[PDB]
Design a protein around this motif. Structure first.
Motif, PDB file in Angstrom:
ATOM      1  N   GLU A 114      34.345  39.863  39.011  1.00 20.43           N
ATOM      2  CA  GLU A 114      36.024  40.210  38.389  1.00 20.43           C
ATOM      3  C   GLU A 114      36.624  38.997  37.896  1.00 20.43           C
ATOM      4  OE1 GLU A 114      40.020  40.946  39.974  1.00 20.43           O
ATOM      5  OE2 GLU A 114      38.469  40.657  41.650  1.00 20.43           O
ATOM      6  N   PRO A 115      36.868  38.096  36.784  1.00 17.78           N
ATOM      7  CA  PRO A 115      37.614  37.271  35.938  1.00 17.78           C
ATOM      8  C   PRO A 115      38.531  36.850  37.241  1.00 17.78           C
ATOM      9  CG  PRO A 115      37.801  38.808  34.275  1.00 17.78           C
ATOM     10  CD  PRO A 115      37.462  39.762  35.971  1.00 17.78           C
ATOM     11  N   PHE A 116      38.515  35.446  37.341  1.00 17.37           N
ATOM     12  CA  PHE A 116      39.644  34.669  38.346  1.00 17.37           C
ATOM     13  C   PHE A 116      40.709  35.063  37.481  1.00 17.37           C
ATOM     14  CE2 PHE A 116      41.227  30.951  39.659  1.00 17.37           C
ATOM     15  CZ  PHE A 116      41.129  31.481  41.032  1.00 17.37           C
ATOM     16  N   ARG A 117      41.311  35.679  36.144  1.00 20.04           N
ATOM     17  CA  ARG A 117      42.337  35.763  35.897  1.00 20.04           C
ATOM     18  C   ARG A 117      43.413  37.188  36.748  1.00 20.04           C
ATOM     19  NH1 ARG A 117      44.209  35.466  29.568  1.00 20.04           N
ATOM     20  NH2 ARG A 117      42.890  33.452  30.178  1.00 20.04           N
ATOM     21  N   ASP A 118      42.505  38.134  36.342  1.00 18.40           N
ATOM     22  CA  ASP A 118      42.955  39.036  36.887  1.00 18.40           C
ATOM     23  C   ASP A 118      42.916  39.090  38.502  1.00 18.40           C
ATOM     24  OD1 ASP A 118      42.047  39.992  34.559  1.00 18.40           O
ATOM     25  OD2 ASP A 118      40.578  40.442  34.357  1.00 18.40           O
ATOM     26  N   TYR A 119      41.955  38.361  39.357  1.00 15.36           N
ATOM     27  CA  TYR A 119      42.199  38.280  40.706  1.00 15.36           C
ATOM     28  C   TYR A 119      43.263  37.244  41.134  1.00 15.36           C
ATOM     29  CZ  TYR A 119      41.107  35.113  44.857  1.00 15.36           C
ATOM     30  OH  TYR A 119      41.702  34.547  45.648  1.00 15.36           O
ATOM     31  N   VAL A 120      44.047  36.279  40.625  1.00 18.59           N
ATOM     32  CA  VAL A 120      45.115  35.712  40.438  1.00 18.59           C
ATOM     33  C   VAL A 120      46.300  36.543  40.477  1.00 18.59           C
ATOM     34  CG1 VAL A 120      46.124  33.304  40.576  1.00 18.59           C
ATOM     35  CG2 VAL A 120      43.818  33.655  39.877  1.00 18.59           C
ATOM     36  N   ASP A 121      45.927  37.415  39.651  1.00 17.31           N
ATOM     37  CA  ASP A 121      47.329  38.643  39.035  1.00 17.31           C
ATOM     38  C   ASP A 121      47.101  39.182  40.559  1.00 17.31           C
ATOM     39  OD1 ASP A 121      46.702  39.219  35.245  1.00 17.31           O
ATOM     40  OD2 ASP A 121      47.528  37.651  36.693  1.00 17.31           O
ATOM     41  N   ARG A 122      46.661  39.895  40.065  1.00 16.86           N
ATOM     42  CA  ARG A 122      46.297  40.783  41.990  1.00 16.86           C
ATOM     43  C   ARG A 122      46.383  40.259  42.905  1.00 16.86           C
ATOM     44  NH1 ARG A 122      41.861  43.055  44.208  1.00 16.86           N
ATOM     45  NH2 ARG A 122      40.580  41.334  42.899  1.00 16.86           N
ATOM     46  N   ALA A 139      37.932  33.812  46.728  1.00 17.56           N
ATOM     47  CA  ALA A 139      37.182  34.111  45.400  1.00 17.56           C
ATOM     48  C   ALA A 139      36.175  34.377  45.746  1.00 17.56           C
ATOM     49  CB  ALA A 139      38.225  32.854  45.099  1.00 17.56           C
ATOM     50  N   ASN A 140      35.273  34.604  44.756  1.00 16.47           N
ATOM     51  CA  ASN A 140      34.193  34.979  45.189  1.00 16.47           C
ATOM     52  C   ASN A 140      33.037  33.954  45.139  1.00 16.47           C
ATOM     53  OD1 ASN A 140      33.471  33.756  42.667  1.00 16.47           O
ATOM     54  ND2 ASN A 140      33.609  35.993  41.675  1.00 16.47           N
ATOM     55  N   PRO A 141      32.272  34.014  45.911  1.00 13.65           N
ATOM     56  CA  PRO A 141      31.224  33.093  45.676  1.00 13.65           C
ATOM     57  C   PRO A 141      31.326  32.104  44.512  1.00 13.65           C
ATOM     58  CG  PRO A 141      30.128  34.749  47.135  1.00 13.65           C
ATOM     59  CD  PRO A 141      30.773  35.438  46.130  1.00 13.65           C
ATOM     60  N   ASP A 142      31.038  32.430  43.584  1.00 11.17           N
ATOM     61  CA  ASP A 142      30.864  31.631  42.671  1.00 11.17           C
ATOM     62  C   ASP A 142      31.881  30.465  42.464  1.00 11.17           C
ATOM     63  OD1 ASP A 142      28.149  32.474  41.721  1.00 11.17           O
ATOM     64  OD2 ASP A 142      28.540  33.870  40.279  1.00 11.17           O
ATOM     65  N   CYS A 143      32.931  31.019  41.948  1.00 16.46           N
ATOM     66  CA  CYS A 143      34.471  30.394  41.886  1.00 16.46           C
ATOM     67  C   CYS A 143      34.702  30.272  43.202  1.00 16.46           C
ATOM     68  CB  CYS A 143      35.561  31.206  41.321  1.00 16.46           C
ATOM     69  SG  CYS A 143      36.901  30.601  41.636  1.00 16.46           S
ATOM     70  N   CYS A 153      37.501  28.188  36.641  1.00 18.09           N
ATOM     71  CA  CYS A 153      36.726  29.668  36.713  1.00 18.09           C
ATOM     72  C   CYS A 153      36.821  30.643  35.823  1.00 18.09           C
ATOM     73  CB  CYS A 153      37.348  30.500  37.880  1.00 18.09           C
ATOM     74  SG  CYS A 153      36.584  29.575  39.954  1.00 18.09           S
ATOM     75  N   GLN A 154      37.321  30.073  34.492  1.00 18.24           N
ATOM     76  CA  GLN A 154      37.515  30.079  33.686  1.00 18.24           C
ATOM     77  C   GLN A 154      35.830  30.893  33.217  1.00 18.24           C
ATOM     78  OE1 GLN A 154      40.389  29.639  31.141  1.00 18.24           O
ATOM     79  NE2 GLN A 154      39.730  30.812  29.412  1.00 18.24           N
TER      80      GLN A 154
END
Ligand SMILES: CC(C)(C#Cc1ccc(-c2ccc(Cl)c3c(NS(C)(=O)=O)nn(CC(F)(F)F)c23)c([C@H](Cc2cc(F)cc(F)c2)NC(=O)Cn2nc(C(F)(F)F)c3c2C(F)(F)[C@@H]2C[C@H]32)n1)S(C)(=O)=O
Ligand SMILES: CC(C)(C#Cc1ccc(-c2ccc(Cl)c3c(NS(C)(=O)=O)nn(CC(F)(F)F)c23)c([C@H](Cc2cc(F)cc(F)c2)NC(=O)Cn2nc(C(F)(F)F)c3c2C(F)(F)[C@@H]2C[C@H]32)n1)S(C)(=O)=O
Ligand SMILES: CC(C)(C#Cc1ccc(-c2ccc(Cl)c3c(NS(C)(=O)=O)nn(CC(F)(F)F)c23)c([C@H](Cc2cc(F)cc(F)c2)NC(=O)Cn2nc(C(F)(F)F)c3c2C(F)(F)[C@@H]2C[C@H]32)n1)S(C)(=O)=O
Ligand SMILES: CC(C)(C#Cc1ccc(-c2ccc(Cl)c3c(NS(C)(=O)=O)nn(CC(F)(F)F)c23)c([C@H](Cc2cc(F)cc(F)c2)NC(=O)Cn2nc(C(F)(F)F)c3c2C(F)(F)[C@@H]2C[C@H]32)n1)S(C)(=O)=O
Ligand SMILES: CC(C)(C#Cc1ccc(-c2ccc(Cl)c3c(NS(C)(=O)=O)nn(CC(F)(F)F)c23)c([C@H](Cc2cc(F)cc(F)c2)NC(=O)Cn2nc(C(F)(F)F)c3c2C(F)(F)[C@@H]2C[C@H]32)n1)S(C)(=O)=O
Ligand SMILES: CC(C)(C#Cc1ccc(-c2ccc(Cl)c3c(NS(C)(=O)=O)nn(CC(F)(F)F)c23)c([C@H](Cc2cc(F)cc(F)c2)NC(=O)Cn2nc(C(F)(F)F)c3c2C(F)(F)[C@@H]2C[C@H]32)n1)S(C)(=O)=O
Ligand SMILES: [Cl-]
Ligand SMILES: [Cl-]
Ligand SMILES: [Cl-]
Ligand SMILES: [Cl-]
Ligand SMILES: [Cl-]
Ligand SMILES: [Cl-]
Ligand SMILES: [Cl-]
Ligand SMILES: [Cl-]
Ligand SMILES: [Cl-]
Ligand SMILES: [Cl-]
Ligand SMILES: [Cl-]
Ligand SMILES: [Cl-]
Ligand SMILES: [Cl-]
Ligand SMILES: [Cl-]
Ligand SMILES: [Cl-]
Ligand SMILES: [Cl-]
Ligand SMILES: [Cl-]
Ligand SMILES: [Cl-]
Ligand SMILES: [Cl-]
Ligand SMILES: [Cl-]
Ligand SMILES: [Cl-]
Ligand SMILES: [Cl-]
Ligand SMILES: [Cl-]
Ligand SMILES: [Cl-]
Lengths: 220, 220, 220, 220, 220, 220
Positions: B159-167, B194-198, B218-219
């Motif tokens: 999931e893109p970081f932006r969408d997660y921060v939105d949620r 956040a997911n392990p990558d980000c 995290c883009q």
């Protein structure tokens, strides 16, 4: 309606197209759901009897309801006249005749007599008296066109408590009486007609539980 | 509402059909999403208690919430009364009686007494006190009708970081509290979930990263 | 907002329903496309800090963007306070306290203090200062949510020159900087990334060709 | 229309685009249902004869009805002229000539003469006299374009009483007369045309039953 | 915009949400059809340069055209500056500095300086000078984005004369020039590009035929 | 338009977005049906020549009609100038130059000269003169774009009389002339072109039958 100008004088203003359309559309879409009363009360703010008759005459359909409305108005008009017998005599230069029930309802009064009453000092608010009669009539119609009785609102075995309280108070709102009568309905039925799981939970909370506390306790 | 006219005098005005319609429509479409509170606050600018009761009464459905709203209003009204003990005595010709809690809520006060309080010198702003109680009540409804907890908001592996921060912040806004720990939820829970990558990227950013810096990092 | 009455006094007016809806809808439909900034600037004409907070609080979604907006505001608030240290002392009868950064943003100021500042003589325009901070924040979001870089805008082999310049300046408009920086981008890229046929035509026109002349020369 | 401005003077105003549009739309959707009369009366509040002619001229279609409307107007104009014999003579500097029938209808009078009549002291309200003629004409059109007679409105053997009363009074309202016998159609024809099940219930109710009592008694 | 209030004073007003929306919608639906110019001119009635920049900035897309617009504005601004040489010197207490080209375009002038110029005695109407430059620029865009030449507009062998004249003048209006030769395109090119059947009829009409006479003669 | 302020002065007001859109939409939907004339007359209430040119310039399509409109205007302008030869001489301090035909049409007059003419005492109403020319032009277009002649309106053998009179007067309304010419058309054709059954019925009624009586006599 009667509005204030910048001179401090209460003056007649034409009912706006937006006000007429809003009332026609809200009856079209919501029929005699309970929120029709506040919408009608707000849209008829400052109305003359003529404006109120305009609004009610623009309603298409529900003519059985509209005739019940007239019968309510006539009873309230008959009560007004028996409490306010008009006194014969020439009306003085700076005065207005006293209004009869048919004058408040606008059937025997001109718009100019309604303006004279409503802008008098002190004002005799025939528009607000008429509105009272009409809303009294609309309350009967909301209560007559309500499909469900409060005794039939029972929580389903899998029905979320929020949905059940929604139905309970929606039903209770359509049977208008005093809130003394609606507090009695709640204390009599809301917990007793909860489903067996939520009922046992709410019995333990005791009679002093707020609705917010009851809804948190039966969450899922 | 009570607004200033074009000359500088505080006058009563009818609630407009657009204001009535806008509030009905916002509840219809958004229910008790957080943005209903600013819409209600802005649409009730200058409202009398009668206007606020009109707006609340035009809400169709959500009657369980509306009942919670009355219970909050009644609690605040009782608190108001306990902080404003009654002074018995004839009201003088020029002035107005002190308002009880039920007067601010509009259940025992007429619109003319509400105008009298709001246009007094100094004004007793019953509409803004009432409004403050309602928004306090609506805030509880938003908190209660928020489905998800902030501890359950976590970024997916793709999931893109932006969408997660939105949620994340959409959720945080519905779960209402003071900034004492909402300030706390950000900056550590936002990274922790956040997911392990980000998450690995964000540790390297170190403390003191802006949200823009975290979102840029995290883009990709 | 703060508007002028016919007495020459700057007085508070309620934010209109139409203004609220217009801002909600334009964010709904256009997200953070560059034309959101002028729409926000025009819709917030004369706004108080309260109105600006109302508008931003009514936005549904894009809460990551809205949090970046708050971080921008807080940095600008911190800069304002370090350039305007408040001086302690009783506020005089005919005066207003000096506003802090949190007062301009509306987190520590009442609407009445904002009206006092904005209608003072001379006015201290907290609404226009706040708006500056917000638009500074919105510019960052437009630049962050821009999908394409200026270096990736290359004219296709069959792509009409008008469509390519459309994409070029649309992309350039979303990366806001000075026009010194945008004149440099054009002189560096617009002709060099034209397709080989149009590029050879425009090289012959020379650096002094207007855009109108360049577009006529690569017509089809 | 001629309305009072914010200072108390009667001024000419242009008919608004919303008023024009609302009247065109109401004729388009409702034709000559009875509710077109109140819509026309309310939308023409304060109208000059020119405004009324504008509204009538914007109607597309129904030209047979519109021609009947002119014939009614001409009959009333001739009646007006027979009741207001002409007085020949030079009109004095301050005042205005007496209006003929064609002047009230706006065919031989300019808008400035209509303003002069309507803002005179005392006013000669040509707009309201004209309006009264038009509504008289529109009432004929409603009567004529009403498809069904009240003697043909009868409750089906399985039709709910409410729906039948709706049809009954909808029909009675289109077949227009004085309350001399419309009062007569109710209470006996309404019972006579009920189905045998409800009819048997309504005899037992006896004379003097309200419509609410009849509708409650034939619910089941 | 700068408009006159109800008392006769020139005041700044916020651009309305309807004006903003109407201009955005017109560009969205009509692009640079010729009727966009009158819409822009009418919607910008009384505009300040800030208002004009707002309107132009709300345009989404067509950024190649908008860049051509800036280049036209800059050419006119440079022409303005060459015709209005700068006079250095302290500006006196009552009055305002002379505007440069960039001030009329709003890039180096504040809104208060634009109000000061536009409400001066005599007024320096920077908004109307700016508007004149923009429409000059928009006229170029219409000319450029017009797909077809008037020499390619010809009546089909079965195409009704009315439809051909519609296409002819629609095209002529987009290909913009002075009436020096647009007057010329009619009356001879309109006949020359008629089909042989109508062309034969139109020779017989002879010189001096009105367009109504030509359209009546080629109906059948 | 030119409206009255509260000082009693006729002052210029911007054409509203709603007025512009209403005129564009009514042409879009109704073309040159006869009700376009009253809509145009009402929407252009108080218009300056500039406003009238704005409205006509916003029309998309029907450019053949719009060119016929210009030719009509030019003939009326030529007639005005030959009836009002302008007298050379310096215009006095408190005066306006006399308007030529091109000044009324707005091609050689500024909006400020049009305001000066229209608000003069006495006013020289160039806007109402121009409107007369335009409506004269629109009447020709309605008559030219009418598909059917009055001689072709014949009642069908099964066609209801109301539908036939609808078509008859709809057709008659599009061929505008004096009502002397339209009374002659009715007396010549309406009964004679009724179908054989209704014709024999109406012949017996005699020439003095009202249309209401004729339509009742041929009911079905
Ligand atoms: C002019 C006009 C528009 C008016 C008015 C009008 C006047 C006063 C009040 C009121 C205000 C504050 C309180 Cl604290 C109480 C109270 N506190 S109490 C002793 O505990 O009950 N009571 N009231 C009614 C009073 F004063 F009349 F008694 C009130 C209301 C409330 C306004 C309101 C609506 C709302 F949604 C939520 C709110 F928080 C407040 N509206 C109602 O309450 C209607 N309603 N009915 C019932 C039911 F039947 F189910 F029980 C239910 C409601 C409900 F609240 F919606 C909710 C689901 C429950 N409106 S008009 C002539 O058109 O009517
Ligand atoms: C209802 C009403 C009466 C009011 C008010 C009201 C009053 C003050 C403020 C405010 C203003 C400026 C700053 Cl800098 C801060 C701050 N800075 S700070 C030290 O970091 O906390 N805090 N505040 C709240 C304060 F003052 F209350 F503390 C503010 C707001 C902001 C306005 C705003 C909204 C917005 F979108 C973007 C902005 F830039 C500013 N609205 C909120 O913040 C709501 N919100 N909530 C949360 C969450 F819960 F997730 F955290 C989140 C937001 C969010 F910003 F949207 C974003 C996703 C994050 N509104 S009204 C007039 O609208 O009708
Ligand atoms: C208040 C507010 C609403 C504001 C303001 C605001 C203030 C001033 C100016 C401006 C006015 C006149 C000129 Cl002549 C220039 C200039 N001449 S110059 C030295 O050659 O560049 N520059 N400017 C910007 C200035 F002054 F800021 F520098 C201007 C603008 C222009 C208005 C405008 C818009 C338009 F569409 C067409 C026009 F003809 C004029 N808007 C922009 O130009 C935005 N834009 N950006 C770029 C890009 F990035 F691609 F290059 C592009 C544009 C573009 F023009 F649209 C076009 C495709 C190119 N707006 S706010 C706070 O919300 O912003
Ligand atoms: C056009 C205009 C200029 C006007 C006016 C105008 C003037 C007066 C009155 C009126 C007011 C109050 C009462 Cl108590 C009676 C009455 N009581 S009584 C002794 O029983 O007859 N009568 N009246 C008419 C009066 F005065 F003319 F006699 C009235 C009305 C009512 C307003 C109204 C409408 C409504 F819906 C419900 C109401 F409660 C009141 N409108 C009508 O009654 C129309 N109507 N017609 C019939 C039918 F034909 F079927 F019977 C039916 C109605 C009906 F009510 F809708 C309902 C189904 C029955 N309007 S305007 C300002 O609107 O533009
Ligand atoms: C933008 C703005 C600032 C302005 C202005 C503006 C200013 C003046 C005039 C004008 C007025 C009257 C006449 Cl008699 C003539 C004339 N008579 S003449 C000797 O034959 O040339 N000429 N003019 C233009 C003038 F003065 F500029 F010369 C005019 C117009 C006309 C208004 C108009 C529009 C319309 F539809 C029908 C009308 F009857 C009048 N608009 C145009 O004419 C545009 N147009 N262009 C062409 C073409 F190119 F194809 F030929 C065509 C038209 C057309 F008419 F539509 C029609 C198909 C032909 N508008 S604004 C206030 O709108 O926002
Ligand atoms: C400013 C402006 C908007 C104007 C005006 C304007 C001015 C006056 C009049 C008018 C008023 C009253 C009467 Cl009693 C007569 C009359 N009585 S008479 C001697 O018997 O004919 N005549 N008139 C026209 C007059 F005065 F001009 F002669 C009138 C009209 C009528 C208004 C009207 C419209 C309507 F629908 C129904 C009405 F009851 C009244 N509008 C017309 O009549 C148009 N019309 N045309 C024909 C046809 F051709 F088919 F016959 C037909 C009509 C028709 F009525 F609709 C109907 C089907 C028949 N409008 S503008 C510059 O844009 O035009
Ligand atoms: Cl309106
Ligand atoms: Cl009435
Ligand atoms: Cl009906
Ligand atoms: Cl409900
Ligand atoms: Cl819940
Ligand atoms: Cl409104
Ligand atoms: Cl109340
Ligand atoms: Cl991002
Ligand atoms: Cl609004
Ligand atoms: Cl605030
Ligand atoms: Cl949200
Ligand atoms: Cl863009
Ligand atoms: Cl091109
Ligand atoms: Cl309008
Ligand atoms: Cl008229
Ligand atoms: Cl029932
Ligand atoms: Cl608006
Ligand atoms: Cl600017
Ligand atoms: Cl033709
Ligand atoms: Cl508008
Ligand atoms: Cl012009
Ligand atoms: Cl066109
Ligand atoms: Cl028609
Ligand atoms: Cl019929």
């Amino acid at each position: 309606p009667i509005v204030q100008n910048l001179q401090g004088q209460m003056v007649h203003q034409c009912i706006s197209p937006r006000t007429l359309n809003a009332w026609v559309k809200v009856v079209e879409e919501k029929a005699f759901s309970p929120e029709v009363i506040p919408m009608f009360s707000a849209l008829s703010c400052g109305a003359t009897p003529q404006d109120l008759n305009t609004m009610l005459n623009t309603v298409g359909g529900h003519q059985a309801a509209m005739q019940m409305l007239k019968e309510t108005i006539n009873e309230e008009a008959a009560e007004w006249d028996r409490l306010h017998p008009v006194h014969a005599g020439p009306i003085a230069p700076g005065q207005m005749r006293e209004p009869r029930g048919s004058d408040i309802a606008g059937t025997t009064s001109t718009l100019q007599e309604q303006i004279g009453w409503m802008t008098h000092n002190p004002p005799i608010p025939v528009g607000e008296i008429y509105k009272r009669w009409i809303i009294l009539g609309l309350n009967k119609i909301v209560r007559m066109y309500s499909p469900t009785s409060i005794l039939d609102i029972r929580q389903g075995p899998k029905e979320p408590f929020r949905d059940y309280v929604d139905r309970f108070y929606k039903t209770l709102r359509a049977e208008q009486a005093s809130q003394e009568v609606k507090n009695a309905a709640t204390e009599t039925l809301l917990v007793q007609n909860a489903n067996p799981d939520c009922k046992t939970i709410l019995k333990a909370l005791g009679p002093g539980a707020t609705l917010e506390e009851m809804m948190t306790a039966c969450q899922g």
